[PDB]
Design an enzyme around this catalytic site. Sequence first.
Site, PDB file in Angstrom:
ATOM      1  N   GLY A  67       4.864  10.354   3.919  1.00  0.00           N
ATOM      2  CA  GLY A  67       4.431  11.634   4.663  1.00  0.00           C
ATOM      3  C   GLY A  67       3.966  12.601   3.971  1.00  0.00           C
ATOM      4  O   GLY A  67       3.890  13.962   4.459  1.00  0.00           O
ATOM      5  N   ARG A  74      -1.330  -6.656  19.043  1.00  0.00           N
ATOM      6  CA  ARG A  74      -1.819  -5.031  18.566  1.00  0.00           C
ATOM      7  C   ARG A  74      -2.063  -4.426  19.746  1.00  0.00           C
ATOM      8  O   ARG A  74      -1.772  -3.456  19.695  1.00  0.00           O
ATOM      9  CB  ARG A  74      -3.003  -5.404  17.588  1.00  0.00           C
ATOM     10  CG  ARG A  74      -2.804  -5.564  16.047  1.00  0.00           C
ATOM     11  CD  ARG A  74      -3.864  -5.655  15.215  1.00  0.00           C
ATOM     12  NE  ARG A  74      -3.589  -6.692  14.138  1.00  0.00           N
ATOM     13  CZ  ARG A  74      -3.192  -6.269  13.016  1.00  0.00           C
ATOM     14  NH1 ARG A  74      -2.879  -4.838  12.736  1.00  0.00           N
ATOM     15  NH2 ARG A  74      -2.991  -6.802  11.812  1.00  0.00           N
ATOM     16  N   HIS A  95      -8.412   7.764   3.360  1.00  0.00           N
ATOM     17  CA  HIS A  95      -8.292   6.686   2.341  1.00  0.00           C
ATOM     18  C   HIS A  95      -8.252   7.077   0.889  1.00  0.00           C
ATOM     19  O   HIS A  95      -9.303   7.924   0.665  1.00  0.00           O
ATOM     20  CB  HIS A  95      -9.551   5.724   2.848  1.00  0.00           C
ATOM     21  CG  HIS A  95      -9.517   4.385   1.914  1.00  0.00           C
ATOM     22  ND1 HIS A  95      -8.758   3.476   2.273  1.00  0.00           N
ATOM     23  CD2 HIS A  95     -10.166   4.360   0.783  1.00  0.00           C
ATOM     24  CE1 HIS A  95      -9.074   2.446   1.252  1.00  0.00           C
ATOM     25  NE2 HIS A  95      -9.879   2.882   0.539  1.00  0.00           N
ATOM     26  N   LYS A 145      -3.499  12.361  -4.570  1.00  0.00           N
ATOM     27  CA  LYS A 145      -2.687  12.864  -3.273  1.00  0.00           C
ATOM     28  C   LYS A 145      -2.980  14.169  -3.435  1.00  0.00           C
ATOM     29  O   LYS A 145      -2.966  14.850  -2.357  1.00  0.00           O
ATOM     30  CB  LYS A 145      -1.405  12.331  -3.520  1.00  0.00           C
ATOM     31  CG  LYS A 145      -1.014  11.101  -2.729  1.00  0.00           C
ATOM     32  CD  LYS A 145       0.366  10.878  -2.807  1.00  0.00           C
ATOM     33  CE  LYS A 145       0.806   9.521  -2.044  1.00  0.00           C
ATOM     34  NZ  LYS A 145       2.243   9.376  -1.593  1.00  0.00           N
ATOM     35  N   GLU A 154      -5.974  14.576  -1.634  1.00  0.00           N
ATOM     36  CA  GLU A 154      -5.926  14.234  -0.311  1.00  0.00           C
ATOM     37  C   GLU A 154      -5.221  15.377   0.580  1.00  0.00           C
ATOM     38  O   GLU A 154      -5.698  15.593   1.467  1.00  0.00           O
ATOM     39  CB  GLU A 154      -5.019  13.193  -0.078  1.00  0.00           C
ATOM     40  CG  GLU A 154      -5.526  11.722  -0.550  1.00  0.00           C
ATOM     41  CD  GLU A 154      -4.377  10.674  -0.797  1.00  0.00           C
ATOM     42  OE1 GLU A 154      -4.435   9.492  -1.296  1.00  0.00           O
ATOM     43  OE2 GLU A 154      -3.532  10.695   0.243  1.00  0.00           O
TER      44      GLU A 154
HETATM   45  N1  V9A Z   1     -10.018  -0.838  13.084  1.00  0.00           N
HETATM   46  C1  V9A Z   1      -9.357  -0.050  12.036  1.00  0.00           C
HETATM   47  N2  V9A Z   1      -8.138   0.317  12.075  1.00  0.00           N
HETATM   48  C2  V9A Z   1      -7.807   1.039  11.201  1.00  0.00           C
HETATM   49  S1  V9A Z   1      -6.204   1.613  10.903  1.00  0.00           S
HETATM   50  C3  V9A Z   1      -6.721   2.698   9.645  1.00  0.00           C
HETATM   51  C4  V9A Z   1      -5.610   3.441   9.010  1.00  0.00           C
HETATM   52  C5  V9A Z   1      -5.551   3.153   7.410  1.00  0.00           C
HETATM   53  C6  V9A Z   1      -5.758   1.605   7.219  1.00  0.00           C
HETATM   54  C7  V9A Z   1      -4.856   1.246   6.336  1.00  0.00           C
HETATM   55  C8  V9A Z   1      -5.232  -0.323   6.151  1.00  0.00           C
HETATM   56  C9  V9A Z   1      -6.136  -0.906   5.333  1.00  0.00           C
HETATM   57  C10 V9A Z   1      -6.080  -2.213   5.768  1.00  0.00           C
HETATM   58  C11 V9A Z   1      -4.757  -2.467   6.197  1.00  0.00           C
HETATM   59  C12 V9A Z   1      -3.866  -3.919   6.509  1.00  0.00           C
HETATM   60  O1  V9A Z   1      -4.337  -4.790   6.042  1.00  0.00           O
HETATM   61  N3  V9A Z   1      -2.715  -3.654   7.232  1.00  0.00           N
HETATM   62  C13 V9A Z   1      -1.728  -4.552   7.659  1.00  0.00           C
HETATM   63  C14 V9A Z   1      -0.242  -4.142   7.377  1.00  0.00           C
HETATM   64  C15 V9A Z   1      -0.004  -3.280   6.168  1.00  0.00           C
HETATM   65  C16 V9A Z   1       1.092  -2.953   5.829  1.00  0.00           C
HETATM   66  O2  V9A Z   1       2.111  -3.410   6.429  1.00  0.00           O
HETATM   67  O3  V9A Z   1       1.594  -2.039   4.965  1.00  0.00           O
HETATM   68  C17 V9A Z   1      -1.837  -4.732   9.086  1.00  0.00           C
HETATM   69  O4  V9A Z   1      -2.938  -4.087   9.887  1.00  0.00           O
HETATM   70  O5  V9A Z   1      -1.170  -5.515   9.728  1.00  0.00           O
HETATM   71  O6  V9A Z   1      -4.150  -1.321   6.523  1.00  0.00           O
HETATM   72  C18 V9A Z   1      -7.834   2.671   9.229  1.00  0.00           C
HETATM   73  C19 V9A Z   1      -8.567   1.704  10.369  1.00  0.00           C
HETATM   74  C20 V9A Z   1      -9.855   1.377  10.278  1.00  0.00           C
HETATM   75  O7  V9A Z   1     -10.668   1.996   9.784  1.00  0.00           O
HETATM   76  N4  V9A Z   1     -10.446   0.617  11.343  1.00  0.00           N
HETATM   77  N1  GAR Z   2      -5.436   2.175   3.382  1.00  0.00           N
HETATM   78  C1  GAR Z   2      -4.698   3.337   3.674  1.00  0.00           C
HETATM   79  C2  GAR Z   2      -3.928   4.046   2.484  1.00  0.00           C
HETATM   80  O1  GAR Z   2      -4.226   3.288   1.382  1.00  0.00           O
HETATM   81  N2  GAR Z   2      -3.525   5.080   2.758  1.00  0.00           N
HETATM   82  C3  GAR Z   2      -2.708   5.859   1.691  1.00  0.00           C
HETATM   83  O2  GAR Z   2      -1.433   5.794   1.614  1.00  0.00           O
HETATM   84  C4  GAR Z   2      -0.789   6.987   1.202  1.00  0.00           C
HETATM   85  C5  GAR Z   2       0.135   7.650   2.313  1.00  0.00           C
HETATM   86  O3  GAR Z   2       0.799   8.904   1.576  1.00  0.00           O
HETATM   87  P1  GAR Z   2       1.782   9.856   2.357  1.00  0.00           P
HETATM   88  O4  GAR Z   2       2.670   8.918   3.237  1.00  0.00           O
HETATM   89  O5  GAR Z   2       2.747  10.511   1.219  1.00  0.00           O
HETATM   90  O6  GAR Z   2       0.778  10.615   3.142  1.00  0.00           O
HETATM   91  C6  GAR Z   2      -2.067   8.123   0.785  1.00  0.00           C
HETATM   92  O7  GAR Z   2      -2.107   7.981  -0.482  1.00  0.00           O
HETATM   93  C7  GAR Z   2      -3.196   7.430   1.501  1.00  0.00           C
HETATM   94  O8  GAR Z   2      -4.393   7.441   0.647  1.00  0.00           O
END
Ligand code: V9A
Ligand code: GAR
Length: 200
Positions: A11, A64, A108, A170, A173
Amino acid sequence: ARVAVLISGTGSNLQALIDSTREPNSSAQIDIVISNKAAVAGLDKAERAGIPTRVINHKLYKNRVEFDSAIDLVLEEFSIDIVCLAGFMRILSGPFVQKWNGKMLNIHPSLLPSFKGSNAHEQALETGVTVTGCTVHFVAEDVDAGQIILQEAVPVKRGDTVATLSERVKLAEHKIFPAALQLVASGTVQLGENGKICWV
Ligand SMILES: Nc1nc2sc(CCCCc3ccc(C(=O)N[C@@H](CCC(=O)O)C(=O)O)o3)cc2c(=O)[nH]1
Ligand SMILES: NCC(=O)N[C@@H]1O[C@H](COP(=O)([O-])[O-])[C@@H](O)[C@H]1O
Ligand code: NA
């Protein structure tokens, strides 16, 4: 604008968002923090900030849609306008993404469209780029392909690991996520009629 922050772990992005939205001129207020995993540090940061938290365990839902639906219920309970995905690692279902089209932001840790998916830093190191970065974008159904709000480049240094690269990324970010939230919360940026970023 009333904001929900969704998290899965530490977080640090949440905390940066908390800090920015307490500035007098912030157009966003964080009214609810939702984690899909309990005991994660982001829940503590929210509680230290006085922000309500809810844990919605994706592992307890058949699919989901029912899980997202549970999240959507809490968003409605708190009359949420804007959803920030801040380290939230679950892919969201189509109908949920559609309902929140133009209202949901994700951070991201790459310069999209490079290195989509869950291991961006690993990809960037394996590829050998010397510049990476981070992206805030509107969440579209196509993962990591929604419209790009802000990006910031970050150098890759020789010898970098996931640990050191993600630490440097980060810091960026925590700059562009609050800036991007303020752009959307203020209505300065919207997902345009044609689905591309519209600057007003
Ligand atoms: N449709 C849609 N949904 C979303 S959610 C989001 C937020 C960031 C996306 C993060 C991401 C990338 C790939 C996966 C993945 O493979 N995750 C697994 C479980 C992973 C674990 O356990 O850690 C699952 O989803 O089970 O996660 C962005 C976004 C979008 O751009 N489009
Ligand atoms: N595909 C999404 C992804 O890679 N998310 C990444 O997880 C971290 C969360 O950090 P935080 O929990 O300290 O904010 C961040 O670095 C973000 O870019
Ligand atoms: Na969306």
